[PDB]
């Protein structure tokens, strides 16, 4: 598993990260310089995720997206051979 950085740049007061890698629970993100951020160790390969921003499910329009089998929009990224890549 490689350290991987998630960064929400869309603002807000309170932000959670939800994705396949935490079974779609809600991880509190840390405010840092107008970002909200978290760092997770993730195995190489695909992950889907989304944000929960002041009470509302939101994706990041600047990362790739896909429609899930539930019929919802997630971000989709590919963890590769780099430590602390920012998504
Ligand atoms: O919780 C896990 C989950 O979280 C994230 O989803 C959130 C999402 O981003 C939000 O937008 C919001 O979703 C609401 C949405 O906006 C509304 O449209 C509505 O959803 C309706 C759909 O429009 C409509 O498609 C229909 O859905 C039916 C499906 O067509 C059908 O396929 C089936 O769904 C089942 C799947 O086939 C199955 O794979 C399994 O789903 C899993 C996913 O594959 C998986 O990615 C993950 O889902 C994430 C998700 O990707 C995030 O975006 O977890 C799933 C395991 O549970 O299970 C399905 C059976 O439940 O069934 C449904 C109908 O039963 O109907 C809905 C009307 O509800 O409502 C949304 C509010 O719930 O919220 C979610 C988090 O709640």
Curated annotation (Swiss-Prot):
Taxonomic superkingdom: Eukaryota
Phosphothreonine: modified positions: 72
Q: In which tissues is it expressed?
A: Highly expressed in kidney, heart, white adipose tissue, lung and spleen.
Effect listed in the UniProt record for changing residue 74 to Q: Significantly reduces glycogen-binding
Using the UniProt annotation, give all residue ranges assigned to the region (Glycogen-binding domain).
Answer: 1-87
Substituting residue 70 to A results in:
Significantly reduces glycogen-binding
Question: Phosphoserine (modified residue): where?
Answer: 20, 25, 32
Share the record's PTM remark.
Answer: Phosphorylated when associated with the catalytic subunit (PRKAA1 or PRKAA2). Phosphorylated by ULK1; leading to negatively regulate AMPK activity and suggesting the existence of a regulatory feedback loop between ULK1 and AMPK.
Disulfide links within the chain? none
Domain remark in the UniProt entry: The glycogen-binding domain may target AMPK to glycogen so that other factors like glycogen-bound debranching enzyme or protein phosphatases can directly affect AMPK activity.
Say which family it is in: Belongs to the 5'-AMP-activated protein kinase beta subunit family.
Q: What does this protein do?
A: Non-catalytic subunit of AMP-activated protein kinase (AMPK), an energy sensor protein kinase that plays a key role in regulating cellular energy metabolism. In response to reduction of intracellular ATP levels, AMPK activates energy-producing pathways and inhibits energy-consuming processes: inhibits protein, carbohydrate and lipid biosynthesis, as well as cell growth and proliferation. AMPK acts via direct phosphorylation of metabolic enzymes, and by longer-term effects via phosphorylation of transcription regulators.
Q: How does it assemble?
A: AMPK is a heterotrimer of an alpha catalytic subunit (PRKAA1 or PRKAA2), a beta (PRKAB1 or PRKAB2) and a gamma non-catalytic subunits (PRKAG1, PRKAG2 or PRKAG3). Interacts with FNIP1 and FNIP2.
What is the name of the protein in this document?
5'-AMP-activated protein kinase subunit beta-1
Source species: Rattus norvegicus (Rat)
Positions spanned in the full protein: 77 to 163 of 270
């Amino acid at each position: 598993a490689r350290p991987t950085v998630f960064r929400w740049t869309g603002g807000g007061k309170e932000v959670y990260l939800s994705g396949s890698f935490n079974n779609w629970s809600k991880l509190p993100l840390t405010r840092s310089q107008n970002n909200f951020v978290a760092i997770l160790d993730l195995p190489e390969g695909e992950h889907q995720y989304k944000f929960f921003v002041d009470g509302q499910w939101t994706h990041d329009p600047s990362e790739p997206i896909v429609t899930s089998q539930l019929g919802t929009v997630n971000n989709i990224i590919q963890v590769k051979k780099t430590d602390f890549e920012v998504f």
